[PDB]
Amino acid sequence: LSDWWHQSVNVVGSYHTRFGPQIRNDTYLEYEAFAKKDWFDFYGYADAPVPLFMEIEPRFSIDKLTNTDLSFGPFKEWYFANNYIYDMGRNKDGRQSTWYMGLGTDIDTGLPMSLSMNVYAKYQWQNYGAANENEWDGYRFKIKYFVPITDLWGGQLSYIGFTNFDWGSDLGDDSGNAINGIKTRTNNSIASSHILALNYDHWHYSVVARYWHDGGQWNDDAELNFGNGNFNVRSTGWGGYLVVGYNFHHH
């Protein structure tokens, strides 16, 4: 229901993406959904070509459920947080199933914005055949903030930012070395996003600047050869996205 459940279908163009060994530029369809009902909030999105990649972020209110005001300081609420990533891949080999679970919260900055912080531990199932499949591996700190800016061109301009700090994984240790001498993979990783979004009654346009540090836990500059010659991994740097979509909702 529009009251709490929001949907959107979007077209996305990406440029210089860094989650994998080689740089990428893609375009694809995407389904989004944002929800917020008294005891649980949710965000998720699914991408499909011009096979299937989805990421969901469900969170449950410990306060609402425990029915105990755990509010304290800037900390408005506490949550049992979940960040689940699924990638079907073209094989049964080139797939990913990642579950991050932990503690989350909403911060009251006294400013005209929204701020959330989460910490998770994660179990790794499939991971494109990597050395860390099926085991508890690594942790993640996720910080995301929303900031209403102004009205621009008849729409509402706003800023959104979130970062995923991943560390403590055992890959890198358990992976080999590159032709390069350095290790192929990484125990940690950072993916930071900056979003400028224009929202109209239904249509919206968004520009996304994203920065990676060892994107996808690929050790930046590692020298590899997949059968086409040696090449260096460029897992650290900027990439971007253009997003045009439509939010559904009855009047």
XYZ file of C-alpha atoms in Angstrom:
251
model
C 0.000 0.000 0.000
C 1.194 3.510 -0.941
C 0.788 4.497 2.714
C 3.983 2.667 3.720
C 5.042 0.641 0.663
C 6.687 2.482 -2.244
C 7.645 0.965 -5.581
C 9.618 2.160 -8.561
C 10.856 0.767 -11.871
C 14.044 2.309 -13.247
C 16.458 2.250 -16.150
C 20.100 2.428 -15.102
C 23.284 3.291 -16.929
C 26.522 2.531 -15.089
C 30.041 3.708 -15.913
C 33.332 2.319 -14.583
C 31.826 -0.038 -12.023
C 34.316 -1.792 -9.698
C 32.798 -4.812 -7.948
C 34.634 -7.231 -10.227
C 38.117 -8.067 -11.614
C 37.564 -6.002 -14.774
C 35.943 -2.569 -15.083
C 32.357 -2.454 -16.323
C 29.761 -0.192 -17.912
C 26.229 -1.529 -18.065
C 22.618 -0.555 -18.568
C 19.688 -2.399 -17.091
C 16.210 -2.436 -15.622
C 15.683 -2.163 -11.894
C 12.848 -2.643 -9.462
C 12.930 -0.710 -6.174
C 10.862 -0.886 -3.017
C 11.044 1.139 0.189
C 8.802 0.344 3.161
C 8.330 1.608 6.729
C 5.689 0.164 9.046
C 5.649 0.749 12.811
C 7.900 -2.246 13.635
C 9.952 -2.725 10.487
C 11.580 -0.711 7.715
C 12.794 -2.076 4.395
C 14.699 -1.272 1.279
C 15.572 -3.468 -1.628
C 16.245 -3.439 -5.329
C 16.506 -5.919 -8.202
C 18.482 -5.476 -11.439
C 17.920 -7.336 -14.689
C 19.673 -6.975 -18.091
C 18.842 -4.351 -20.723
C 20.409 -12.433 -15.373
C 19.224 -11.254 -11.943
C 20.791 -9.353 -9.067
C 18.948 -8.309 -5.941
C 19.871 -6.754 -2.635
C 17.416 -6.445 0.241
C 17.775 -4.570 3.494
C 15.113 -5.607 6.000
C 15.297 -4.290 9.571
C 13.206 -5.143 12.618
C 12.641 -2.752 15.503
C 13.923 -4.174 18.759
C 12.067 -1.377 20.531
C 8.672 -2.027 18.931
C 9.076 -5.776 19.334
C 10.654 -5.803 22.818
C 8.136 -3.081 23.569
C 10.822 -1.317 25.593
C 12.017 2.224 24.918
C 15.680 1.444 24.261
C 16.095 5.025 23.114
C 19.338 6.582 24.358
C 21.212 9.755 23.455
C 21.127 10.527 19.696
C 20.010 6.926 19.265
C 16.292 7.086 18.511
C 15.720 3.394 17.820
C 17.511 0.046 17.624
C 17.133 -2.685 15.022
C 17.911 -6.258 14.167
C 19.478 -5.388 10.792
C 19.831 -7.498 7.626
C 21.619 -6.857 4.349
C 21.127 -9.782 1.951
C 22.734 -9.870 -1.510
C 21.823 -12.353 -4.231
C 23.324 -12.677 -7.699
C 22.028 -15.516 -9.886
C 24.911 -15.373 -12.365
C 25.056 -17.243 -15.697
C 26.246 -20.479 -14.064
C 25.700 -22.071 -10.672
C 29.366 -21.186 -10.237
C 29.262 -17.477 -11.039
C 26.695 -16.731 -8.348
C 26.555 -15.011 -4.971
C 24.471 -15.348 -1.822
C 25.526 -13.116 1.043
C 23.852 -12.545 4.366
C 24.827 -9.700 6.699
C 23.014 -9.656 10.068
C 23.515 -7.443 13.070
C 22.599 -4.359 15.034
C 21.324 -1.140 13.511
C 20.125 2.292 14.617
C 18.634 5.681 13.736
C 20.539 8.795 14.843
C 18.949 12.104 15.735
C 21.357 14.820 14.586
C 19.011 17.697 15.372
C 19.631 18.665 11.749
C 17.166 18.388 8.801
C 18.440 14.973 7.724
C 18.227 11.266 8.446
C 21.201 9.202 9.602
C 21.481 5.448 10.088
C 24.310 3.165 11.194
C 24.488 -0.637 11.095
C 27.064 -3.301 11.958
C 26.806 -6.819 10.709
C 28.503 -10.142 10.836
C 27.980 -12.295 7.770
C 27.650 -15.810 6.518
C 28.863 -16.386 2.982
C 27.234 -19.023 0.789
C 28.139 -18.838 -2.890
C 30.604 -16.170 -3.883
C 31.543 -16.728 -7.536
C 33.615 -19.727 -6.449
C 35.841 -17.714 -4.130
C 37.831 -19.154 -1.218
C 35.431 -17.766 1.362
C 32.328 -19.654 0.298
C 30.190 -21.320 2.926
C 31.532 -19.967 6.180
C 31.162 -17.066 8.529
C 33.420 -14.419 7.005
C 34.017 -10.697 7.574
C 31.989 -7.813 9.004
C 30.332 -4.703 7.641
C 29.609 -1.248 8.930
C 27.003 0.591 6.888
C 26.321 4.265 7.310
C 23.640 5.996 5.236
C 22.137 9.444 5.344
C 19.305 11.305 3.609
C 19.279 15.075 3.180
C 16.430 17.099 1.633
C 17.983 20.007 -0.283
C 15.464 22.220 -2.124
C 12.966 22.500 -4.916
C 14.575 22.626 -8.330
C 12.917 22.605 -11.763
C 9.485 21.820 -10.357
C 10.837 18.796 -8.546
C 12.390 18.112 -5.170
C 16.145 17.879 -5.170
C 17.771 15.793 -2.458
C 21.055 14.180 -1.473
C 21.657 10.614 -0.408
C 24.849 9.055 0.768
C 25.804 5.642 2.133
C 29.021 3.716 2.612
C 29.751 0.063 3.176
C 32.944 -0.558 5.159
C 33.785 -4.238 4.937
C 36.638 -5.782 6.848
C 37.784 -8.917 8.642
C 37.181 -11.318 5.779
C 39.704 -14.110 5.273
C 39.980 -13.868 1.471
C 43.209 -12.333 0.293
C 44.839 -14.496 2.941
C 43.281 -17.610 1.425
C 43.563 -16.602 -2.222
C 46.719 -16.768 -4.264
C 49.066 -14.104 -5.558
C 48.937 -12.262 -8.856
C 51.465 -12.363 -11.677
C 52.122 -8.975 -10.070
C 53.637 -10.417 -6.888
C 50.973 -8.814 -4.698
C 47.958 -10.723 -3.436
C 44.969 -11.145 -5.753
C 42.176 -10.589 -3.198
C 41.447 -8.442 -0.147
C 40.404 -8.943 3.483
C 38.582 -5.636 3.395
C 36.795 -3.260 1.059
C 34.976 0.071 0.814
C 32.204 1.207 -1.497
C 31.003 4.759 -0.945
C 28.050 6.342 -2.748
C 26.930 9.948 -3.331
C 23.517 10.537 -4.830
C 21.876 13.654 -6.220
C 18.196 12.897 -6.843
C 15.390 14.886 -8.502
C 11.889 13.747 -7.561
C 8.668 14.685 -9.288
C 5.240 13.252 -8.522
C 6.212 9.980 -10.263
C 9.312 10.439 -12.357
C 12.720 10.902 -10.863
C 16.250 11.331 -12.135
C 19.353 10.504 -10.104
C 23.056 10.949 -10.573
C 25.284 8.592 -8.597
C 28.983 8.990 -7.930
C 30.509 5.907 -6.391
C 33.961 5.267 -5.026
C 35.551 1.892 -4.383
C 38.600 0.886 -2.396
C 39.485 -2.630 -3.476
C 36.048 -3.024 -5.034
C 34.569 -6.472 -4.525
C 37.582 -7.212 -2.414
C 39.826 -7.328 -5.470
C 43.293 -6.147 -4.585
C 43.816 -3.006 -6.611
C 46.536 -3.358 -9.259
C 46.787 -7.127 -8.999
C 48.092 -8.434 -12.326
C 46.021 -11.233 -13.836
C 45.575 -13.061 -17.154
C 42.195 -14.603 -17.989
C 43.384 -15.834 -21.367
C 43.687 -12.605 -23.357
C 46.895 -11.261 -21.946
C 48.023 -9.700 -18.715
C 45.924 -6.918 -17.294
C 45.858 -4.985 -14.031
C 42.913 -4.777 -11.698
C 41.579 -1.279 -11.132
C 39.472 -1.924 -8.042
C 40.092 1.477 -6.495
C 38.502 4.570 -7.969
C 35.339 6.296 -9.165
C 32.424 5.120 -11.246
C 28.922 6.415 -11.742
C 25.298 5.790 -12.501
C 22.452 7.610 -14.238
C 19.016 6.571 -13.053
C 15.623 7.342 -14.533
C 12.583 5.684 -13.058
C 8.932 5.905 -12.142
C 7.412 5.650 -8.653
C 3.965 4.076 -8.522
C 1.177 5.312 -6.245
C -2.559 5.944 -6.424
C -3.837 9.471 -5.800
